[PDB]
Ligand binder design. Structure first.
Ligand SMILES: [Cl-]
Ligand SMILES: [Cl-]
Ligand code: NA
Ligand code: NA
Lengths: 129, 129
């Protein structure tokens, strides 16, 4: 599924991401936009052989199981395919584990390089929240 | 899920692949082995921007929707994520459409280059079918 911007903001807020570890909702929407263009089915192969999955491009090296990332963990205890669902629950719960892991949202390279320090409020602009 | 060889043979047979368009079950098991190493979560990006999904590496250019393959069809009328499920139904039904499409199993490049003409019977060797 490709979410609309305010649609995703609404789902993220319902699932507890607004100000989760101090990150406002616009940060998460911005992260999703550059990671996946709001597409829950987005996948991207990493040079190391791991894969990034879903609206927040969650990596198989640590977070999920895809059965093809040697010597990787599945800290969110989910199959990576779960991260491609129409329903963003698995992705949101896993993201909460990631963002708590010590580097906050710097875990998402696209966040640090394209969202961090910018006017993230704008990503929740027109939205009935 | 990573299927065992006879496990997958059993699922493929239950779903009507044995001798489907004249291709014996060992052809389909062989195709799956080289496409995905029996891993329903396998994905592979194609240079054209399309993606191959699931145990039979079914391509987004024609067969499924992933919302990121411009000008592609979804002839099996399914989201590509469906092709990564533990349950191979969507993959099998879609494969039946593909293999009927005119080039038979030559649709799977790995089949034509690694299975075609070989002793495919061996792939269903130990299996209680
Ligand atoms: Cl932080
Ligand atoms: Cl044929
Ligand atoms: Na993993
Ligand atoms: Na498509």
């Amino acid at each position: 599924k490709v979410f609309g911007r305010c649609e995703l903001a609404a789902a993220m807020k319902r699932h507890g991401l607004d100000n989760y570890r101090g990150y406002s909702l616009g940060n998460w929407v911005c992260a999703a936009k550059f990671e996946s263009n709001f597409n829950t089915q987005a996948t991207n192969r990493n040079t190391d052989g791991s894969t990034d999955y879903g609206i927040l491009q969650i990596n198989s090296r640590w977070w999920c199981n895809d059965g093809r990332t040697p010597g990787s963990r599945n800290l969110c205890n989910i199959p990576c395919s779960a991260l491609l669902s129409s329903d963003i629950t698995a992705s949101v719960n896993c993201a909460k584990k990631i963002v708590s892991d010590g580097n906050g949202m710097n875990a998402w390279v696209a966040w640090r390089n394209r969202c961090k320090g910018t006017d993230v409020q704008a990503w929740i602009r027109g939205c009935r929240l």
